[PDB]
Design a protein around this ligand. Structure first.
Ligand SMILES: [Cl-]
Ligand SMILES: [Cl-]
Length: 162
């Protein structure tokens, strides 16, 4: 298991514009297109992203390409972030995958807002971090995906994904 297979399980794959759990226009492997209600505002962002007239549909390859860009940006954002970087650097390889997953889903800004849990992760207080992570809108809104990520942080294994 690696970050790519992990996120591919969490986000699924869809070749047609779809609405995410929050109701935003998405495509591929969890690639947010726009928070705008407009399906046209979304088709346009889509064309801009792919560099062709897609008419709301892309191929597997195109989805994978977006996905490679997104994981890369996720990692690079963590590394450029003063609050996130030190957490990441402190962690083992499995747990770094968990942090990257949260960033991919909620953006750097969002994750940086889990100040208390980040401090616990940094101190390697696993059980306490898992409890604090659960007190969040994130866990209440997407409990199954949250539990997987949280178990990954508590255990440092890929069991939740096995
Ligand atoms: Cl893009
Ligand atoms: Cl869920």
């Amino acid at each position: 298991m690696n970050i790519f297979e992990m996120l591919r399980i969490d986000e699924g794959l869809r070749l047609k514009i779809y609405k995410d759990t929050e109701g935003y226009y998405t495509i591929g492997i969890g690639h947010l297109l726009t928070k705008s209600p407009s399906l046209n505002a979304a088709k346009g962002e889509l064309d801009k992203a792919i560099g062709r007239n897609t008419n709301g549909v892309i191929t597997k390859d195109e989805a994978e390409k977006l996905f490679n860009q997104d994981v890369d940006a996720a990692v690079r954002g963590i590394l450029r972030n003063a609050k996130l970087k030190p957490v990441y650097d402190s962690l083992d390889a499995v747990r770094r995958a968990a942090l990257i997953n949260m960033v991919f889903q909620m953006g750097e800004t969002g994750v940086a807002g889990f100040t208390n849990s980040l401090r616990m992760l940094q101190q390697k207080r696993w059980d306490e971090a898992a409890v604090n992570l659960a007190k969040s809108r994130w866990y209440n809104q997407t409990p199954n995906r949250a539990k997987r990520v949280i178990t990954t942080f508590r255990t440092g294994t890929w069991d939740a994904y096995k």
